[PDB]
Amino acid sequence: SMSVKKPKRDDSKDLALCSMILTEMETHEDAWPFLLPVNLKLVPGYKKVIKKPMDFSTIREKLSSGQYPNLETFALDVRLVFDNCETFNEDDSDIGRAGHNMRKYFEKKWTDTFK
Numbered sequence: 826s827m828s829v830k831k832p833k834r835d836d837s838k839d840l841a842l843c844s845m846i847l848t849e850m851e852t853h854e855d856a857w858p859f860l861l862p863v864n865l866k867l868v869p870g871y872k873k874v875i876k877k878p879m880d881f882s883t884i885r886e887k888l889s890s891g892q893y894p895n896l897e898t899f900a901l902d903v904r905l906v907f908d909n910c911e912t913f914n915e916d917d918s919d920i921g922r923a924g925h926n927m928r929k930y931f932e933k934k935w936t937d938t939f940k
């Protein structure tokens with residue numbers, strides 16, 4: 826509260842560490858469904874169903890331009906990618922499996938890096 830401060834995380838390396846995690850996700854072999862925005866003109870139903878599209882290239886642009894105020898907003902956008910994937914794809918499809926795989930991959934890097 827006012828004039829009563831908690832000790833807080835050293836956050837000075839957060840930007841660089843998130844960038845490294847994102848690089849590891851960008852280069853994963855199962856990243857291909859998530860590298861670019863889904864083409865809303867070519868993919869029936871996506872525009873109406875998925876209220877907040879997100880993809881790795883949009884996250885990278887946002888990270889490179891100071892649009893994440895903290896590491897938690899970065900993780901929210903990453904998770905949104907996989908939450909969207911689950912919404913639109915069956916678990917046993919190729920894209921569906923890729924999403925589960927990439928989510929697992931992310932969360933381990935996230936825990937190992939920050940928790």
Ligand SMILES: CC(=O)c1cccc(O)c1
Binds near residue numbers: 859863868913914920
């Ligand atoms: C990420 C996703 O949900 C996707 C990507 C390409 C084609 C498609 O139908 C869906």
